[PDB]
């Protein structure tokens, strides 16, 4: 599955960071079966923390590390699964992953963004 | 000018520009023998060694002023140029541009470009190229850039008239190179389609391959004749599509909905929350295995929903929703299906199931007009178009030849040990006739010995075949090596057939010695081609060899582009839709595995392009439209249809006419040997006569008036027309009595007894009729007449059935079976209707030819079937699970023994074989018939390409490249045999024509007397211009209604009426329905307005023009339809009647034809064809009827597997004729055959108690099923070929004759006054020498200008005694010059002679002694 | 396939008879657990009383001595999808005359759906002392015979006529 994300995303401290993610799946998005997981790992060999998940609706896990700054910013039926991180902080630097399953499409999609926080 | 060769110099240029200045100061065609691209004329001879490939002064004097110059190739090729400095930089004298031309004109360069193109094609074929292909495409872009730079640097870019860009193909090269540059240096995006654009590289082939430009030009010019016949096909598809839209609008949406919706659900709350085809099934009725609901219908003759299921109209059209009639668009699509007959069986069995069986009439009309008529019009015009070219070219060709001869002639006028002993021995030992007969009988025996293969071959038989092929290889090898040493090895390899034999014996020794286990088709099929050495003697198989040799010969370049096309489309399909499939497979095949026909690989892409070529495009089109959208897929598939089918049709007609040119390719003298076989024939005849004489010698050494009265009586009573009519009445009634014998006959328990007693009465009447004919004609005259024999046979069968019934010996096996032979009773009618009689005796006169061209076909298919049996022989034995029917996965149950173990441990698993497999040459013939008719070929192919071994579970596509076998088979068989066949048929249907004196074959006497007047109607043109009537206002009214303005406005009004009739669609808003009704109201009132205007003006004369009669008919029908449909809508209810009445409005749409001369002439050819088509339709209806009776008789209680539904089931003379009409177009006969072929009771159940009836046993008889279906297919094919010939003859006829009529009376009166000035005595006799001034004294059109004697001798005027001539013969001879050779000539000749003999009985003074030409021949 | 036939309506006393009742399913391919009840009203009485019930290839015959024995199932065998409920009545006595209601009770078994149809067929049965040949038979026979006779008469008439004609002709010359 083709997943389009910026490999590196550079955002100023305090600004809003939209993490763009779209995916080219031919099959129509069935909200009763579509699956999306967004996770966060500090490094390629570090632990992933799921922070948002779609399962027939939007699920925001409200991880303490993000406070209430995470928002969904996509539209699954339009093949957009982007998220928004409001008022970015230096600790938000790291790796963010968009996982995508669009049954009955066989292949799972994976986008990986390296978010860097500028002064 | 043999010495016209001067290097292009600056001095010459100076003279050129000087002459240009002289021309410009004072203000012919280019000679078609000095153009570029052709070959250099011979008058120049060979080129000096230095001058070749160098700027040469332009040789055509046409360009002698322009700044142009030629350079000639070392192969004497011509190349124009422009002497203007290229790009205002490179003079023709700059050594750079010099060597540029040098490198451009060559043969290394064309081969370079062609090789690069071929490599680039090979690289295109890959779908996922590895990394180094980047550098390879770099190299190709490099070569293209360099060659384009060479060309543009040599011939100038555009800075001159003769230049790069003016070359049209060079535009394609420019596009290719610039797109390569962009695609490499911009990374534009969405490259999935950009990458495709580089396929145009493969088109540069056409520019490079010497002599393809002319072929593509030929095809392009062959299209331009499809102007009218495409207007007409769009128009007919549109009219029939509006009809289909009006009848079936939204019909293919009925779905057997449930009836016990709980949870307070309704149809809508459900139809919203319902997505998965596993959930639709819970609420609708899906057949055991299928992916649609069960189309039902509200009427009684449509399908039927099972109990507890109501038929409602909701959901999604059938077949992925693409095919239906909901919108005009889908109507046009479904009708393109039904016209190209491409899997139309499913549209048939879907509408007939939804709308009702009664609507089969619609299909009858569509398939007979739209499928049959259009394909024939196409096949006509291209043919005619193609034929034209041949004549022209061949004419032009021979013309040039003559010039060459004259060209030549002008030049001629200007000139004015014991090893040799053994060799001789053996060369005598190869006795031409006897050893030739030996080789031939051994060839035929080897073939008939290979055909003895079957699937379960006992090892004894197998080793027998082994040693047999051993001995045959030995014999053939021995004789070939003998012939080799008999003559010089060189002389042996000289003759082609010996190369053939040597190649084949080589292959045989190869696989005998090496025992190649990996390949079987390597040898076991190639030893077969020896059967072609029968071409030596067989003068028909030799025609198949000549057709093929043409296909790879003279008419071979054309075939090339076909390959190119079938390649290009192929790779196009692989680049657009390639990734699309694998990405979207889950939609088109629920298993998430690519469908059998994807385009994800080049091979499969070529498969699908071949499939759409052979006329099966629709299923692949649904899949492709599901995945890659309806936008690209329709463009691609319609482009493939049109282009590919056009090229295949031009190829086919090319081979056809080039083989029929047997009259034009007959230039051979007496054969060096008539037939080496015939030598042995004569010699054995000599020997047999010798031994006959000797044995006869040795045998002789060892040893009442009343009776003739009665016969005249009976002759009268049997010729008397009342008797013939009565007999035909009885025949028709007997056929009806047969037709009522359904399966429901036991329910109608009164019709049964009436029909029984009526069968008794009918057999009695026919016995009495037989006796009457006997007493009348006499056994001698009677048994001579064949028709009388068919009557005798059939009435004797009836008599023996009757006596067996009355004796009580019924139910004694055969006798009961004999009752089914009763079904031949309708055939007794074949002799009473002269239409059927004349068609049947035509086809019987044409049988002999198809005997030869079916024997060659049978040998050919036998070759293919043994090739088959060798490859596929019990490798079809899959281990299916019967519950769903899914071949088990080859991972488990690999070898059959495991399939049987699984049977033992489980259920519903059957080591199942196909039913039309290749197990022995018998079933081989059947499956080849299927593959050659594309009906079932798909199942045979799939189960074959999965073959693994003699008994092993077939893997999914373990032997893929055996598809090739089918395609190669298809081609030859279905595209050469047929071709060959068609050849003789036209020749045959030409010879028979010439046999009768140009008469038309398929018409009676009366039909011909009609036909002649129907031809009279065509091109009448005596039409009087109606006079302008006497009234002020009527004045302006007529002035209006006569101008082209008013008529063209009416036409555009009709076109708008069409476009407002097609803009309706299923489910449209109420508002749109009302406004369309009001627009139609306005169109109705406006057309009535123009009719009333024509009436007001033309007065009575309106009803003169036939087209005006049609206008009045349509306007009345239309206002009726309006009012009556209104009354239906308000008073009555039934919608079906309402729509079938409202359908009448399309008359106005039909009214368009008036304007187009082109559309009219076509369908006028149709209406003059309709007689012959009526006779053929009658005969085809007899055959369809006779087969329908057999259907109802023995195929009624067969199982219901596939193509035999609850409907379409041989259970009634209604359903039986449905199915027979289905398979009349050869469609779907595979399916109808499939359930009959069950015999043994794991497939059937021969003790199935049919409820109500009493005929146990529910599986038909295979040996009669295959006979039934193959015979009906072949008869349908012959009758359809007759139809094709009829329509093509009519089309060839209408075009050739164009005619007008001149007539004048005052010309006679001026002829009389000029007669008095030369004949004062009114003796009606004038001197021939004085006629030289007489004929030059008349006024036009009778005036003939001096010299008159040049033409007067050619008129053939008789002369009475005394060098004198009558008045009438001169007046008529002059009359024939102006009026021509019309039918009125000989009629006017009679009336003027009869009026003269009544006034001048003195015949003694009329007797002519000679004519004008014979006397001059006596003078000279 | 299946064909709805109407039973015969008269039985010859002291002999055997077969009461047809064929209730073909609308769509052949589907399957069901058919089981039937036959009830009957003796001509002269007014009540429909059950005589037999046939479910799962066994004929539980009711205790009416009007049918003690004398009847056996002639309907579909060993299928449990009956589709032919005809019974056979050996020994037709005079008490077997009246009306017969053939109740079917189909349970069409579907994808996720069990419809339970009840079709009812009714039959009129007369016990006759002697088989009256059906009116259609004798009418058809008489029609065939008179038609044969009139056809031969017309033919021989036209024959004698044309013969007298051509005879006068041949004797004229
Ligand atoms: C050399 C050159 C040879 C010719 C090449 C060009 C020939 C044809 C080009 C046709 C281009 C068609 C473009 C269609 C655009 C389109 O996408 O339009 C949409 C419409 C309506 O779709 P919908 O909105 O109902 O979709 C709902 C989907 N559902 C209903 C299946 C569930 O699709 C439709 O009407 C289907 C329209 C089909 C029209 C017939 C195509 C012409 C056939 C034969 C012509 C003679 C050859
Ligand atoms: C679903 C559609 C439902 C609506 C259909 C509405 C229309 C259907 C039927 C109306 C038929 C009305 C009669 C048509 C023939 C009228 C007629 O009078 O036709 C005469 C012609 C011969 O007369 P003429 O033209 O030589 O007249 C001499 C005058 N001059 C030469 C100057 C032209 O005969 C011919 O060709 C006859 C050719 C007849 C072809 C009829 C085909 C109808 C389709
Ligand atoms: O042939 C030569 C002749 C032909 O005789 P024709 O048909 O009567 O001639 C009719 C013609 N119009 C005429 O006036 O001249 O007739 C001939 O002579 C040729 C030989 C005919 C031989 C057979 C005659 C059979 C006559 C019927 C025999 C008895 C059949 C009995 C059938 C069963 C009982 C009804
Ligand atoms: C050189 O001069 C020849 C001339 C006589 C010409 O006679 C022509 C009569 C029409 C005829 C038979 C001819 C050529 C193409 C033929 C067509 C080719 C197509 O093939 C078919 C059948 C096979 C299909 C595969 C394709 O379609 C037909 C529908 C089409 C066809 C058979 C219709 C009939 C055409 C020959 C005499 O001159 C003195
Ligand atoms: C002249 C005869 C003998 C051969 C004709 C072959 C053509 C029909 C083939 C060759 C090139 C192919 C074309 C190559 C490129 C395109 C563009 C393609 O559209 C796109 O790629 C859009 C891409 C985008 O929008 O990003 C549609 C198919 C099409 C027309 C193909 C249609 C089929 C074509 C014209
Ligand atoms: C020229 C040769 C022409 C041969 C024509 C032969 C006779 C052609 C006669 O055709 C009409 C019969 O087919 C009608 O009989 P059916 O039984 O199909 O229709 C009645 C259906 N019910 C009444 C049972 C419902
Ligand atoms: C109409 C005139 C016919 C002219 C041409 C003669 O063809 C007559 C066919 O209708 C004969 O029918 P068949 O018996 O061949 O049809 C069924 C095939 N079997 C399996 C029963 C033998
Ligand atoms: C019907 O019943 C009779 C009497 O038992 C029996 O002999 C016959 O075999 C049965 N026939 C059928 C068709 O079942
Ligand atoms: C009917 O006949 C039976 C004998 O078969 C007899 O026992 C019974 O009484 C009769 N019933 C009537 C109402 O006559």
Residues of C in contact with B286 (CB under 8 A): 111
- Among A116, A107, A77, which Cα is nearest to A3's? A107
Helix (H, G, I), strand (E, B) or coil at B878: strand
Residue ID of nearest Cα to ligand 3 atom 21: B778
Strand partners, B1359: B1410
CA of B1215 to the centre of ligand 6 (A): 13
B498 is written with which tokens?
């010996």
The answer to whether the beta carbons of residues A19 and A84 sit under 8 Å apart is yes
Question: What residues are paired with B315 via a beta bridge?
Answer: none
List of chains touching C (3+ CB pairs within 8 A): B
Report the candidate in B420, B344, B341 with the shortest Cα–Cα distance to residue B374: B341
Residue B238 structure tokens: 């549109």
- Cα B359–B361–B363 angle (5° rounding)? 85
CA C107, CA C32: separation in Å to the nearest integer?
5
Cα B231 to Cα B224: distance, rounded to the nearest angstrom: 12
List, as ranges, residues 411-470 from B with C-beta within 8 Å of A.
none
CA B538 to each of CA B165, B465, B659, B1222: distance values in angstroms, whole numbers, following the listed order:
55, 28, 16, 38
With CA atoms as reference, report the closest residue to C144 among B1255, B162, B737, B658: B737
CB atoms within 10 A of CB C151: 15
3-state secondary structure C54-116: ECCCCEEECCCHHHCCCCEECCCCCCCCCCCCCEEECCCCHHHCEEEEEEEECCEECCCCEEC
Residues of chain B neighbouring A26 (CB-CB closer than 8 A): 580, 583-584, 587, 627
Of the candidates B1064, B1136, B1109, B1125, the one whose C-alpha atom is nearest the C-alpha of residue B362 is B1136
Minimal C-alpha gap between B913 and chain A (Å): 34
Closest CA to B1318 of B1332, B1307, B1304, B1308: B1332
The alpha carbons of chain C give a radius of gyration, in whole angstroms, of 27
**Cβ contact B583–A26 (<8 Å):** yes
Pocket of ligand 2 (CB under 6 A): B 243, 1017, 1020, 1023, 1104-1107, 1109-1110, 1113-1114, 1117, 1143-1144, 1146-1147
Best mutation site among B192, B586, B592, B626 for testing chain A: the one with the most A CBs within 10 Å? Answer: B586
| Structure tokens belonging to residue B919 | 């197990």
Kindly determine whether residue B743 and residue C83, on different chains, have CB atoms separated by under 8 Å. Answer: no
Contact flag B1252-C28 (C-beta cutoff 8 Å) = no
CB pairs under 8 A between B and C: 118
* DSSP element (H, E) containing B1411: strand B1408-1411
The H or E element that residue B636 is part of is helix B618-660
Q: Please report which helix (H) or strand (E) contains residue A111, including its range.
A: strand A109-118
Instruction: Determine the Cα–Cα distance for residues B638 and B237; give it in Å rounded to an integer.
Output: 15
| In the block, residue with structure tokens 């056979």 | C88
List of chain C residues whose C-beta atoms are within 8 Å of the C-beta of residue B758: 144
Structural contact between residues B1107 and B1054, judged by C-beta atoms closer than 8 angstroms:
no
Query: Which of B259, B307, B713 is facing C26, going by the closest CB pair?
Result: B307
Q: From CA B965, how far away is CA B959, in angstroms rounded? A: 11
- What distance in Å separates the CA atoms of residue B537 and residue B669, rounded to the nearest whole number? 17
Rounded distance between C-alpha atoms, residue B1338 and residue B1377, angstroms: 14
Contact of B627 with chain A, judged by CB distance below 8 Å, is answered with yes
Cβ(B639) – ligand 1 distance below 6 Å: yes
Q: Is the CB of C164 inside 8 Å of chain B's CB atoms? A: no
Please name the method used to determine this structure. Answer: cryo-EM
Specify the residue with its C-alpha closest to ligand 1, atom 14. Answer: B631
Round to the nearest angstrom and report the end-to-end CA distance of chain B: 43
Which ligand has the minimum distance to the alpha carbon of residue B647? Answer: 5
Residue B983, token pair as written in the block: 């050849």
Within an 8 Å CB–CB cutoff, is residue C68 touching chain B?
no
CA A16, CA A11: separation in Å to the nearest integer? 8
Please state, in angstroms and rounded to a whole number, the distance separating the CA atoms of residues B278 and B269. Answer: 18
CA dist B323 → B328, B483, B618, B1143 (Å): 11, 65, 10, 22
The torsion region of residue B491 among left (phi > 0), alpha (psi -120 to 50) and beta comes to: alpha
**Which candidate from C6, C30, C83 shows the least CB-CB separation from B747?**
C6
Give the whole-angstrom CA distance, residue B295 versus residue B317: 10
**Region class of B1178: left (phi > 0), else alpha (psi between -120 and 50), else beta:** alpha
The chains found to touch B (3+ Cβ pairs under 8 angstroms) are A, C
User: B740: CA distance to ligand 6 center in Å?
Assistant: 7
DSSP reduced 3-state for B1322: coil
Q: What's the rounded Cα separation, in Å, for the pair B432 and B455?
A: 39
Q: How long, in residues, is chain B?
A: 1420
Is there contact between B and A if contact means ≥3 C-beta pairs under 8 Å? yes
How distant is the Cα of B380 from the closest Cα of chain A, in angstroms? 45
- The rounded distance, in Å, linking the Cα atoms of B248 and B1181 is 27
Q: Does C6 touch chain B (CB under 8 A)?
A: yes
In three-state secondary structure terms, A119 is: coil
Q: Does C166 touch chain B (CB under 8 A)?
A: yes
Distance B558 CA to ligand 4 centre (A): 18
Sign of CA dihedral B1193, B1198, B1202, B1206: positive
B1216 CA → ligand 6 middle, Å: 12
Q: Cα separation of B103 and B151, whole Å?
A: 9
- Positive or negative: CA dihedral B86, B89, B94, B100: negative
* Structural tokens at position B333: 């699509």
| Tokens 């004369």, located at residue | B1101
Domain that holds residue B572: 555-660
User: Where in the sequence is the domain holding A69, given as residue range(s)?
Assistant: 1-119
Q: Where are the domains of chain C?
A: 1-173
> For residue B690, with 0-12 CB atoms within 10 Å meaning exposed, 13-18 middle and 19 or more buried, which class applies?
exposed
Any B CB within 8 A of C104 CB:
no
Ligand 1 centroid to Cα of residue B241, in Å, is: 14
Nearest chain B CA: its distance from C163 CA (Å): 5
Residue nearest to atom 28 of ligand 4 (CA): B379
**Inter-chain touch A26–B592, beta carbons under 8 Å:** no
């Amino acid at each position: 599955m083709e997943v389009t994300v910026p490999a590196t995303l550079n955002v100023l401290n305090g600004s809003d960071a939209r993490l763009p993610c779209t995916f080219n799946s031919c099959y129509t998005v069935n909200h009763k079966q579509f699956s999306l997981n967004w996770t966060y790992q500090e490094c390629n060999n570090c632990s992933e923390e799921m922070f948002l998940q779609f399962r027939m609706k939007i699920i925001n896990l409200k991880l303490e590390r993000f406070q209430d700054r995470v928002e969904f910013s996509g539209n699954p039926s339009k093949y957009d699964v982007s998220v928004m991180l409001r008022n970015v902080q230096p600790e938000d630097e790291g790796i963010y992953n968009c996982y995508i399953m669009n049954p009955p499409d066989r292949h799972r999609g994976h986008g990986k963004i390296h978010l860097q926080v500028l002064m | 000018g043999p010495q016209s060769f001067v290097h292009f110099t600056k001095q010459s240029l100076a003279l050129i520009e000087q002459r240009i200045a002289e021309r410009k100061s004072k203000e012919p065609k280019p000679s078609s023998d000095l153009e570029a691209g052709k070959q250099l004329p011979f008058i120049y001879g060979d080129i000096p060694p230095g001058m070749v490939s160098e700027p040469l002064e332009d040789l055509d004097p046409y360009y002698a002023d322009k700044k142009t110059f030629i350079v000639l190739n070392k192969g004497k090729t011509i190349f124009r140029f422009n002497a203007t400095p290229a790009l205002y930089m490179l003079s023709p004298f700059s050594p750079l541009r010099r060597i540029s031309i040098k490198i451009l004109v060559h043969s290394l360069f064309s081969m370079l470009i062609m090789c690069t193109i071929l490599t680039n094609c090979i690289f295109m074929t890959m779908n996922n190229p590895p990394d180094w292909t980047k550098n390879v495409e770099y190299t190709f872009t490099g070569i293209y850039t360099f060659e384009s730079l060479v060309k543009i640097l040599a011939r100038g870019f555009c800075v001159g008239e003769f230049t790069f860009l003016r070359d049209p193909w060079n535009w394609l090269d420019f596009v290719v190179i610039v797109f390569a540059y962009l695609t490499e240096f911009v990374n534009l995006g969405n490259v999935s389609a950009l990458r495709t654009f580089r396929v145009l590289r493969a088109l540069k082939t056409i520019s490079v391959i010497p002599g393809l430009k002319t072929i593509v030009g030929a095809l392009i010019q062959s299209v331009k004749k499809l102007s009218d016949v495409m207007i007409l096909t769009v128009f007919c598809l549109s009219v029939f599509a509006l009809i289909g839209l009006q009848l079936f609008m939204g019909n293919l949406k009925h779905k057997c909905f449930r009836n016990s919706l709980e949870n307070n659900e309704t149809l809508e709350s459900i139809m919203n929350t319902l997505e998965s085809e596993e959930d639709f099934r819970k609420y609708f009725y899906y057949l055991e295995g299928s992916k649609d609901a069960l189309l039902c219908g509200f009427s009684t003759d449509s399908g039927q929903c099972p109990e507890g299921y109501t038929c409602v109209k909701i959901g999604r059209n059938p077949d992925y929703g693409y095919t239906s009639f909901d919108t005009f668009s889908w109507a046009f699509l479904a009708l393109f299906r039904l016209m190209t007959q491409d899997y139309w069986e499913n549209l048939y069995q879907q509408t007939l199931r939804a709308a009702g069986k009664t609507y089969m009439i619609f299909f009858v009309v569509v398939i007979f007009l739209g499928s049959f008529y259009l394909i024939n019009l196409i096949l006509a015009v291209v043919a005619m178009a193609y034929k034209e070219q041949n004549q022209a070219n061949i004419e032009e060709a021979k013309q040039k030849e003559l010039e060459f001869q004259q060209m030549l002639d002008r030049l001629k006028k200007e000139q004015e040990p014991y090893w040799i002993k053994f060799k001789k021995c053996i060369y005598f030992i190869v006795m031409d006739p006897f050893v030739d007969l030996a080789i031939t009988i051994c060839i035929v025996l080897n073939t008939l010995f290979m055909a003895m293969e079957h699937h379960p071959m006992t090892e004894e038989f197998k080793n027998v075949l082994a040693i047999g092929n051993l001995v045959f290889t030995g014999i053939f090898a021995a004789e070939m090596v003998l012939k080799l040493i008999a003559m010089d090895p060189y002389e042996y390899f000289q003759v082609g057939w010996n190369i053939f034999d040597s190649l084949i014996v080589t292959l045989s020794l190869v696989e005998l010695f090496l025992a190649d286990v990996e390949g079987l088709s390597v040898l076991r099929s190639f030893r077969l081609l020896r059967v072609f050495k029968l071409a030596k003697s067989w003068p028909t198989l030799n025609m198949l060899i000549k057709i093929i040799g043409n296909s790879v010969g003279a008419l071979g370049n054309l075939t090339l582009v076909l390959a190119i096309i079938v390649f290009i489309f192929a790779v196009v399909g692989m680049q657009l839709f390639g990734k699309s499939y694998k990405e979207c497979v889950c939609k088109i095949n629920d298993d998430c595995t690519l469908p059998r026909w994807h385009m994800n690989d080049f091979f499969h892409s070529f498969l699908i392009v071949f499939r759409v070529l052979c006329g099966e495009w629709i299923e692949t089109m649904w899949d492709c439209m599901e995945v890659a959208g309806q936008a690209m897929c329709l463009i691609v598939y319609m482009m493939v249809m049109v282009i590919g089918n056009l090229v295949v049709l031009n190829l086919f007609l090319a081979l056809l006419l080039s083989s029929f040119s047997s009259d034009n390719l007959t230039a051979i003298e007496e054969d060096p040997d008539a037939n080496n076989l015939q030598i042995a024939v004569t010699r054995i005849k000599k020997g047999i006569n010798y031994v006959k004489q000797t044995l006869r010698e040795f045998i002789l050494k060892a040893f009442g008036k009343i009776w003739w009265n009665i016969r005249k009586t009976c002759y009268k009573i049997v010729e008397h027309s009342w008797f013939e009519s009565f007999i035909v009445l009885m025949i028709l009634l007997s056929s009806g009595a047969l037709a009522f014998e359904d399966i429901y006959i036991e329910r109608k328990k009164t019709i049964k007894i009436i029909l029984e007693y009526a069968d008794k009465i009918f057999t009695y009447i026919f016995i009495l009729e037989m006796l009457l004919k006997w007493i009348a004609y006499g056994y001698k005259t009677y048994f001579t007449n064949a028709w009388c024999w068919l009557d005798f046979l059939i009435v004797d069968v009836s008599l023996v059935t009757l006596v067996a019934n009355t004796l009580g010996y019924s139910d004694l096996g055969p006798i009961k079976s004999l009752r089914t032979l009763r079904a031949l009773r309708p055939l007794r009618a074949l002799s009473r209707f002269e239409g059927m009689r004349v068609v049947v005796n035509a086809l019987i006169g044409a049988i002999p030819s198809i005997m030869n061209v079916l024997l060659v076909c049978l040998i050919f298919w036998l070759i293919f079937s043994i090739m088959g049996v060798n490859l596929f022989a019990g490798k079809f034995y899959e281990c299916i699970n019967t519950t769903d029917g899914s071949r088990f996965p080859a991972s488990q149950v690999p070898n059959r023994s495991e399939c049987f173990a699984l049977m033992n441990v489980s259920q519903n698993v059957r080591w199942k074989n196909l039913k039309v497999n290749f197990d022995n040459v018998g079933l081989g013939y059947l499956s080849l018939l299927q593959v050659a008719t594309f009906k079932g070929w798909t199942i045979i192919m799939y189960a074959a390409v999965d073959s693994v071994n003699v008994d092993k579970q077939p893997k999914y596509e373990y032997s893929l490249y055996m598809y090739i076998y089918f395609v190669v088979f298809i081609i030859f068989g279905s595209f050469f045999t047929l071709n060959l066949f068609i050849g003789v048929i036209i020749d045959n249907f030409n010879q028979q024509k010439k046999k009768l004196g140009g008469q038309d074959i398929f018409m009676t006497e009366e039909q011909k007397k009609y036909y002649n007047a129907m031809k009279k109607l065509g091109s009448k043109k005596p039409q009087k211009p109606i006079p302008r009537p006497g009234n002020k206002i009527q004045g302006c009214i007529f002035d209006l209604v006569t101008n082209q303005a008013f008529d063209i406005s009416i036409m555009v009004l009709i076109c708008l009426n069409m476009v407002t009739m097609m803009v309706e669609k299923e489910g449209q808003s109420q508002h749109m329905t009302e406004v369309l009704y009001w627009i139609n109201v306005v169109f109705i009132i406006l057309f009535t307005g123009e009719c009333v205007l024509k009436l007001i003006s033309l007065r009575h004369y309106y009803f003169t023009v036939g087209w005006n009669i049609f206008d009045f008919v349509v306007v009345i029908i239309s206002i009726v339809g309006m009012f009556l449909a209104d009354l239906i809508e308000t008073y009555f209810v039934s919608p079906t009647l309402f729509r079938v009445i409202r359908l009448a409005r399309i008359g106005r749409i039909l009214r368009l034809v008036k304007g187009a001369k082109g559309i009219r002439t076509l369908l006028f050819a149709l209406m003059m064809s309709l007689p012959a088509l009526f006779n053929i339709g009658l005969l085809l209806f007899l055959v369809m009827f006779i087969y329908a009776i057999f259907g109802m008789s023995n195929f009624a209680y067969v199982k219901k597997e596939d193509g035999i539904n609850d409907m379409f089931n041989f259970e009634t003379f209604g359903n039986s004729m449905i199915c027979l009409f289905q398979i009349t177009t050869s469609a779907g006969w595979d399916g109808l055959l499939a359930p009959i072929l069950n015999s043994k009771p794991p497939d059937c159940d021969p003790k199935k108690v049919h409820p109500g009836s009493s005929v146990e046993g529910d599986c038909g008889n295979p040996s009669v099923g295959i006979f039934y279906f193959v015979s009906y297919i072949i008869i349908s094919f012959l009758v359809v070929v007759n139809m094709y010939i009829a329509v093509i003859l009519e089309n060839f006829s209408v075009a050739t004759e164009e005619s007008t009529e001149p007539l004048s009376e005052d010309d006679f009166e001026m002829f009389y006054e000029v007669w008095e000035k030369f004949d004062p005595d009114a003796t009606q006799f004038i001197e021939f020498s004085k006629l030289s001034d007489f004929a030059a004294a008349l006024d036009p059109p009778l005036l003939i200008a001096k010299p008159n004697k040049v033409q007067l001798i050619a008129m053939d005027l008789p002369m009475v005694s005394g060098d004198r001539i009558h008045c009438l013969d001169i007046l008529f001879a002059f009359t024939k010059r102006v009026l021509g050779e019309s039918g009125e000539m000989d009629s006017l000749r009679s009336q003027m002679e009869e009026r003269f003999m009544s006034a001048n009985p003195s015949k003694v003074s009329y007797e002519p002694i000679t004519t004008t030409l014979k006397r001059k021949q006596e003078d000279v | 396939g299946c064909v709805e036939v109407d039973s015969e309506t008269e039985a010859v006393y002291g002999m055997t008879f077969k009461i047809l009742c064929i209730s073909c399913k609308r769509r052949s391919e589907t399957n069901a657990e058919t089981f039937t009840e036959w009830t009957f009203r003796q001509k002269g009485t007014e009540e429909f009383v059950k005589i037999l019930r046939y479910e799962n290839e066994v004929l539980q015959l009711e205790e009416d001595e009007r049918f003690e024995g004398r009847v056996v199932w002639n309907g579909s065998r060993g299928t449990k999808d009956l589709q032919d409920l005809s019974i056979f009545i050996t020994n037709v006595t005079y008490n077997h005359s009246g009306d017969y209601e053939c109740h079917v009770y189909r349970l069409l078994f579907f994808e996720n759906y069990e419809h339970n149809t009840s079709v009812v067929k009714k039959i009129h049965i007369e016990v006759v002392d002697k088989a009256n040949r059906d009116m259609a038979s004798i009418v058809s026979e008489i029609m065939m015979y008179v038609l044969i006779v009139v056809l031969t008469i017309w033919l021989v008439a036209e024959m004698i006529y044309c013969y007298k004609k051509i005879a006068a002709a041949t004797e004229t010359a």
